[PDB]
Amino acid sequence: AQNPNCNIMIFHPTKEEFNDFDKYIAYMESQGAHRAGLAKIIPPKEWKARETYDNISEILIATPLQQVASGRAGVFTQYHKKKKAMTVGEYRHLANSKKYQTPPHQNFEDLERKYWKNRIYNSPIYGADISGSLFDENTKQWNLGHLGTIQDLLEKECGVVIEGVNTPYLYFGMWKTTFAWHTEDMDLYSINYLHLGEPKTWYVVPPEHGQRLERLARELFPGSSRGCGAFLRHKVALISPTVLKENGIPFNRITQEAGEFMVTFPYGYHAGFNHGFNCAEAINFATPRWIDYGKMASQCSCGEARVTFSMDAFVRILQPERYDLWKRGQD
Ligand SMILES: O=C(O)CNC(=O)C(=O)O
Ligand SMILES: [Mg+2]
Ligand code: NI
Ligand SMILES: [Zn+2]
Incomplete structure (x- = not known):
């Protein structure tokens, strides 16, 4: 059994291995990458997502979220308070302001210590789930706006044509912005590219x-x-x-x-x-191996999680027994 300790694996594909997304994901899994839950892929040196980031300041963050914590330093919840719209240029200036900027630190480990010691005492502002893409349309490899759709994957594997679309989303972060413990909707894969900025x-x-x-x-x-x-x-x-x-x-x-x-x-x-x-772009995707996880994924029926249009069909086809209850939570 490959990777039995479930370590996070790091991959360095060549330009030739970067040409076929599905094949490379399946190669990583043949080496046990999935056992960790997360893998890093460093693109070939010949590849670029786009030419420059010099023209992104006029993107709008329509609903920036202030992440307010409750609890103790090691065990907390966060809620998201809606703020007034601002551009990426405005958000970048805010992130770099004395109130929100990254503190002085020695290395990543010192910063991690500072995060866990001090996160709850501040409320950073996050631009999340902004539909859109920063990949150049002429980037042909690992372009997150040109991946095969999850609906086409379900049709190829299971024979059923369903409604829905699958598009990428941008995330603008600052120091202490936080993503809480979760799996993806319907226990999908995700891919995330860090376009610019801090780690x-x-x-x-x-x-x-x-x-x-x-x-x-x-x-x-x-x-x-x-x-x-x-x-x-x-x-x-x-x-x-x-x-x-x-x-x-x-x-x-x-x-x-x-x-x-x-x-x-x-x-x-x-x-x-x-x-x-920083600015990241991410999208969900599926492979043949995902189907069995989709069929078993938990679902929120209390009303809180409120998700994409396109999750309807996945629940309807993979989880017909749950469909009725889940949908009542969405309405
Ligand atoms: O960049 C983020 O906001 C964190 N991303 C994810 O949880 C992801 O790609 O699954
Ligand atoms: Mg712009
Ligand atoms: Ni995620
Ligand atoms: Zn719930």
């Missing part, structure tokens, strides 16, 4: 140990758990690496830098934070 630190639980995380989460967030059998789908709960180690939860950590891709695998719980001003 992003990731934590991940191996898929084969996901239920261990879930059990801890129900203990640490007992009211939320009573409210919803799938409350991590609300994307609000944070648990530090010190708390995870204290509770014997298997996990790994890695820092992504600008110019690097990360892939999350089906049912790989992950969380993390941004080091400073």
Whole structure:
């Protein structure tokens, strides 16, 4: 069995191996990459996402979110307070202001310590889930706006044509902006490209140990758990690496830098934070191996998680028994 310790693997494809996305994902899985829940892919040196980032300041962040924490330093929830619209240029200036900028630090490990010690005491502002792309239309390899759609994958594997579309989203971050512990909708893959700026630190639980995380989460967030059998789908709960180690939860950590891709695998719980001003692009995707995870994915039916239009069909076709209840939560 390849990668039995479930370590995060790092790949360095050649330009020739970068030509066929599906084939390269399947190659990574033949080496056991999926067992970690997360892999890093460093693109060939010949590749570029686009020519420059000099013309992005007029993108609009229509609903910036202020991430307000409650709890203790190692175990907290965050809610997202809506703020007034601002451009990327305005957001970048805000991120670099004395109130929000990255503090002085020695290395990534010192910054991580500072994050976990101090995150709850501040409320950073995040631009999330902005539909759009920064890949040049003439970038032909690993262009996240030109990947095969999940609806086409389901049709190829299962024979059923469904409505829906699958497009990329941009994320503008600053110091301390945080992504809570979650798996992807319908336990999909994700791919994330860090276009520019400061790094992003990731934590991940191996898929084969996901239920261990879930059990801890129900203990640490007992009211939320009573409210919803799938409350991590609300994307609000944070648990530090010190708390995870204290509770014997298997996990790994890695820092992504600008110019690097990360892939999350089906049912790989992950969380993390941004080091400073940055811009990432991400999209969900599927492979044949995903189908069986889609059929088993939990779902939020309490009303909180409220998701994309296109998730309807996945629930309807892969989880017909759950469909009725889930849809009542969406209406
Ligand atoms: O960049 C982000 O906001 C964090 N991304 C993810 O959770 C992802 O790609 O799955
Ligand atoms: Mg612009
Ligand atoms: Ni994710
Ligand atoms: Zn819920």
